[PDB]
Design an enzyme around this catalytic site. Structure first.
Site, short mmCIF file in Angstrom:
data_model
loop_
_atom_site.label_atom_id
_atom_site.label_comp_id
_atom_site.label_asym_id
_atom_site.label_seq_id
_atom_site.Cartn_x
_atom_site.Cartn_y
_atom_site.Cartn_z
N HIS A 180 -7.11 -2.89 7.48
CA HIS A 180 -7.48 -2.23 8.71
C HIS A 180 -8.23 -3.36 9.59
O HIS A 180 -8.32 -3.20 10.78
CB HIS A 180 -8.01 -0.84 8.57
CG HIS A 180 -7.12 0.14 8.15
ND1 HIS A 180 -7.57 1.26 7.61
CD2 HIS A 180 -5.79 0.15 8.04
CE1 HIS A 180 -6.57 2.02 7.24
NE2 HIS A 180 -5.54 1.42 7.52
N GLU A 209 4.72 4.80 11.94
CA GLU A 209 3.81 4.71 12.16
C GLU A 209 3.26 3.50 13.25
O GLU A 209 2.32 3.96 14.16
CB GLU A 209 2.69 4.51 11.31
CG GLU A 209 1.10 4.55 11.53
CD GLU A 209 0.68 3.29 11.63
OE1 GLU A 209 0.95 2.15 11.08
OE2 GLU A 209 -0.67 3.50 12.50
N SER A 216 9.57 2.47 -3.55
CA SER A 216 9.66 4.12 -3.27
C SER A 216 9.71 4.33 -1.86
O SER A 216 10.21 5.20 -1.49
CB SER A 216 8.59 4.69 -4.22
OG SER A 216 7.32 4.19 -3.77
N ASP A 228 1.00 -1.18 0.12
CA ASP A 228 0.05 -0.07 -0.05
C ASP A 228 0.84 1.31 0.10
O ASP A 228 0.57 2.16 -0.82
CB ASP A 228 -0.88 -0.16 1.27
CG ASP A 228 -1.72 0.96 1.14
OD1 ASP A 228 -1.35 2.10 1.22
OD2 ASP A 228 -3.24 0.87 0.88
C1 HEM Z 1 -1.25 -1.31 12.64
C2 HEM Z 1 -1.59 -0.96 11.25
C3 HEM Z 1 -2.15 0.01 10.58
C4 HEM Z 1 -2.21 1.35 11.08
C5 HEM Z 1 -1.76 1.71 12.31
C6 HEM Z 1 -2.58 1.93 9.92
C7 HEM Z 1 -2.97 3.41 10.29
C8 HEM Z 1 -3.30 4.19 9.12
C9 HEM Z 1 -3.68 5.44 9.15
C10 HEM Z 1 -3.45 6.39 10.20
C11 HEM Z 1 -4.15 5.86 7.92
C12 HEM Z 1 -4.22 7.37 7.42
C13 HEM Z 1 -5.92 7.50 7.32
C14 HEM Z 1 -6.38 8.98 6.78
O1 HEM Z 1 -6.06 9.98 7.13
O2 HEM Z 1 -7.38 8.87 5.85
C15 HEM Z 1 -3.97 4.75 7.00
C16 HEM Z 1 -4.23 4.66 5.53
C17 HEM Z 1 -4.23 3.63 4.76
N1 HEM Z 1 -3.92 2.26 5.34
FE1 HEM Z 1 -3.48 1.75 7.06
N2 HEM Z 1 -2.83 1.18 9.13
C18 HEM Z 1 -2.45 -0.13 9.39
C19 HEM Z 1 -2.50 -1.10 8.48
C20 HEM Z 1 -2.67 -1.24 7.19
C21 HEM Z 1 -2.80 -2.46 6.35
C22 HEM Z 1 -2.49 -3.74 6.80
C23 HEM Z 1 -3.20 -1.86 5.11
C24 HEM Z 1 -3.30 -2.99 3.81
C25 HEM Z 1 -3.54 -4.04 3.84
C26 HEM Z 1 -3.47 -0.58 5.12
C27 HEM Z 1 -3.83 0.17 3.91
C28 HEM Z 1 -3.99 1.65 4.17
C29 HEM Z 1 -4.09 2.61 3.03
C30 HEM Z 1 -4.34 2.19 1.62
C31 HEM Z 1 -4.25 3.63 3.35
C32 HEM Z 1 -4.59 4.89 2.47
C33 HEM Z 1 -3.19 5.15 2.17
C34 HEM Z 1 -2.16 5.24 3.28
O3 HEM Z 1 -1.64 4.21 3.51
O4 HEM Z 1 -1.67 6.22 3.78
N3 HEM Z 1 -3.14 -0.17 6.51
N4 HEM Z 1 -3.65 3.72 7.76
CA LIG Z 2 5.71 3.19 -5.69
K LIG Z 3 -0.79 3.79 5.82
#
Ligand code: HEM
Ligand SMILES: [Ca+2]
Ligand SMILES: [K+]
Ligand SMILES: *[C@@H]1O[C@H](CO)[C@@H](O[C@@H]2O[C@H](CO)[C@@H](O)[C@H](O)[C@H]2NC(C)=O)[C@H](O)[C@H]1NC(C)=O
Ligand SMILES: *[C@@H]1O[C@H](CO)[C@@H](O)[C@H](O)[C@H]1NC(C)=O
Ligand SMILES: *[C@@H]1O[C@H](CO)[C@@H](O)[C@H](O)[C@H]1NC(C)=O
Ligand SMILES: *[C@@H]1O[C@H](CO)[C@@H](O)[C@H](O)[C@H]1NC(C)=O
Ligand SMILES: [K+]
Ligand SMILES: [Zn+2]
Length: 595
Positions: free
Chosen positions: A351, A258, A190, A108
């Site tokens: 998530h 994070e 990246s 991601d």
């Molecule tokens: C402890 C584990 C994780 C934490 C604490 C976490 C936390 C976060 C946070 C704070 C955001 C930003 C939300 C916003 O402002 O819109 C986010 C976005 C996102 N998370 Fe997670 N996340 C976790 C695990 C994952 C996993 C396992 C995936 C995919 C399998 C994932 C995919 C995404 C995606 C696509 C986004 C939007 C783009 C980005 O990563 O900034 N996340 N996550």
């Molecule tokens: Ca890339």
């Molecule tokens: K993220």
């Protein structure tokens, strides 16, 4: 008028065009359209943006304006009614390790990043948002519903800033607001090297001509490297324990610290790069640091590509894998390589795969000391537990021997994320990822659930009985209808995740289609895809087919026992083999003799 004019905050460059290496920015991948896939441009729109006012105001902004003649439920209300659960017993995925969850977040972070609007760099706009919950400009705060325990304890809202958008000074004409992807759309590591030239240079070891990435000079993991510290202050990683005062890591990606398992992964990847660079210096002592850096970077890139498409996607997509990602037929310069806005919400299925606790295990995969198991929330922006409490080896053992959380219609997102998320600007373990996800869907002008079902050639449920049949769940459909009144208004993030999983997969039909099509494009549209003839030699490709996550661990830790298949649920010792029985990357086919 057709407009490909507006995209200001970006590095400008003449394209080499005959380089055998990717650019850092992702520019020049597509020769006809050099900016396609590059960082710091608009997310692609698979469907047009849907805004309250058709331009920029999200649905839920104006208390009064409806969506299809219905009020949109509060993001926190949907979270409370549907996404929460109390009992962690029985929640774990019986055939997916914690590594499954963790690899998702890695892929991601390589593909997309929609950073929040800055402007609040030493700001009172920050104050008016956090303290006074005042909606306006980039403050789009998450208001607590009535009865919310956080009303009594935090305030009236969680603060929330709208995502960055193209033209912070647009083209003056009149278009829908388009969010920026700050990273390269290509699967190109990246998150390790940067998507911005200046940072990519600062990350490198330029003191020696050995093509290495810079390592920490204050701390080691029993001789093995840590990432350098980010010395930007104030540091959220310092704040979570001011005694320890261990800052966040400096990585190719802003988000590397994070959570502690993401920081771990980033450490594994940086180590592999340095090991690659040293092995290539041995084979080719005449290669300079530039050549060493690019060739290592180029291998690490394919490694991520191979693990993702051979090991990860099949156990996400299950029965739908072959439908959306048939066997590769070569580079197609007509395929849009850019990540879609909707993709950035589809992939947040991850998530619902994060469990409530993280374990450190010893060399016999038993609990490591008295505080082996920790609640997830204590590990957001936590680097001191790596540097000052056992390094990454005990965390990596947990990645192998512990399980991902299973998505459950009754148990969607653990309270560690739903109630106790820490944000790097703020001071409290008090935020709700599920609420932020729903707020963000609106921020980004996401069409509704039935819009996306339509896009994917799926039935569009319009009634209670209809939604019940799609979801195979009477109560969840009911709670949904009482909140949204029409499935048309169901925000894509809860909509797609509500669906029961496809055969042999970990997402439902709508998500399988959205993810499937994106991953088909990130491959087919990528001139530097590892299987694209000329990128690697046929023999280099034979070597590459043998890579595994298990080997990355063997080569970059002091762990000597690992499973063959690191993504499935594995128990020690039955499922673990000695590292000497694991296939190695044979680098002999990278040897370069002028004679
Ligand atoms: C402890 C584990 C994780 C934490 C604490 C976490 C936390 C976060 C946070 C704070 C955001 C930003 C939300 C916003 O402002 O819109 C986010 C976005 C996102 N998370 Fe997670 N996340 C976790 C695990 C994952 C996993 C396992 C995936 C995919 C399998 C994932 C995919 C995404 C995606 C696509 C986004 C939007 C783009 C980005 O990563 O900034 N996340 N996550
Ligand atoms: Ca890339
Ligand atoms: K993220
Ligand atoms: C850049 O590369 C150099 C050379 O490989 C690193 O210097 C070596 O560091 C190790 C561990 O600190 C020492 O045991 C060697 O003796 C060092 N060699 C020299 C010439 O000092 C250097 O630390 C790297 N720089 C960064 C910031 O990572
Ligand atoms: C776990 O899933 C993988 C996915 O391909 C499969 O190969 C393996 O046999 C499964 N093991 C189970 C369900 O115990
Ligand atoms: C902070 O770190 C120290 C070691 O540096 C440890 O003994 C203490 O428990 C930590 N405090 C918190 C609040 O986590
Ligand atoms: C390449 O992609 C375009 C657009 O998706 C498609 O119409 C075309 O048939 C594909 N061409 C080949 C040779 O696969
Ligand atoms: K879209
Ligand atoms: Zn050791």
């Amino acid at each position: 008028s057709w407009e490909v004019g507006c995209g200001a905050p970006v590095p400008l460059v003449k394209c080499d065009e005959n380089s055998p290496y990717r650019t850092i920015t992702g520019d020049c991948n597509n020769r006809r359209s050099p900016a396609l896939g590059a960082a710091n441009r608009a997310l692609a729109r698979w469907l047009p943006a849907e805004y309250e006012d058709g331009l920029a105001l999200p649905f839920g902004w104006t208390q009064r304006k409806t969506r299809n003649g219905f009020r949109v439920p509060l993001a926190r209300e949907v979270s409370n009614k549907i996404v929460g659960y109390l009992d962690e017993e029985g929640v774990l995925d019986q055939n997916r390790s914690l590594l499954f969850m963790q690899w998702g977040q890695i892929v991601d972070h390589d593909l997309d990043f929609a950073p929040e609007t800055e402007l609040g760099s030493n700001e009172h706009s920050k104050t008016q948002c956090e303290e006074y919950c005042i909606q306006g400009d980039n403050c789009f705060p998450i208001m607590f519903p009535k009865n919310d325990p956080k009303l009594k304890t935090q305030g009236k809202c969680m603060p929330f800033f709208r995502a960055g958008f193209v033209c912070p000074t647009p083209p003056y004409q009149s278009l829908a607001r388009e969010q920026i992807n700050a990273v390269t759309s290509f699967l190109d590591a990246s998150l390790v090297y940067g998507s911005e030239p200046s940072l990519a240079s600062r990350l490198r070891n330029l003191s020696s001509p050995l093509g290495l990435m810079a390592v920490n000079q204050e701390a080691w993991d029993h001789g093995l490297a840590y990432l350098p510290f980010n010395n930007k202050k104030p540091s959220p990683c310092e704040f979570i324990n001011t005694t320890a005062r261990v800052p966040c890591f400096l990585a190719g990606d802003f988000r590397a610290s994070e959570q502690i398992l993401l920081a771990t992964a980033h450490t594994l990847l940086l180590r592999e790069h340095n090991r690659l660079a040293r092995e290539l210096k041995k084979l080719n002592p005449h290669w300079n640091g530039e050549k060493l850096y690019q060739e290592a970077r180029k291998i690490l890139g394919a490694f991520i590509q191979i693990i993702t498409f051979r090991d990860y996607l099949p156990i996400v997509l299950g029965s739908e894998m072959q439908k959306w990602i048939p066997p590769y037929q070569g580079y197609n310069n007509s395929v849009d390589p850019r990540i879609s806005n909707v993709f950035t919400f589809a992939f947040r299925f991850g998530h619902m795969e994060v469990p409530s606790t993280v374990s450190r295990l010893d060399e016999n995969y038993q609990p490591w000391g008295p505080e082996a198991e920790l609640p997830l929330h204590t590990l957001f922006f936590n680097t001191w537990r790596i540097i000052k409490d056992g390094g990454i080896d005990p965390l990596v053992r947990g990645l192998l021997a512990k399980k991902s959380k299973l998505m459950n219609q009754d148990k969607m997102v653990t309270s560690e994320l739903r109630n106790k998320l820490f944000q790097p600007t703020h001071k409290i373990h008090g935020f709700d990822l599920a609420a932020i996800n729903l707020q963000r869907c609106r921020d980004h002008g996401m069409p509704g659930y039935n819009s996306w079902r339509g896009f994917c050639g799926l039935s569009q449920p319009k009634t209670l009985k209809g939604l019940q049949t799609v979801l195979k769940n009477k109560i969840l459909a009911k709670k949904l209808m009482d909140l949204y009144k029409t499935p048309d208004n169901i925000d894509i993030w809860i909509g797609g995740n509500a669906e029961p999983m496809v055969e042999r997969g970990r997402v439902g039909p709508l998500l399988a289609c959205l993810l499937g099509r994106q991953f088909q494009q990130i491959r087919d549209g990528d001139r530097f895809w590892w299987e694209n003839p000329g990128v690697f030699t046929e023999k280099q490709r034979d070597s590459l087919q043998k890579v595994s996550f298990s080997r990355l661990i063997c080569d970059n830790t002091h762990i000597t026992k690992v499973p063959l298949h690191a993504f499935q649920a594995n128990n020690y010792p039955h499922d673990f083999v000695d590292c000497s029985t694991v296939d190695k990357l044979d680098l002999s086919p990278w040897a370069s003799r002028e004679n």
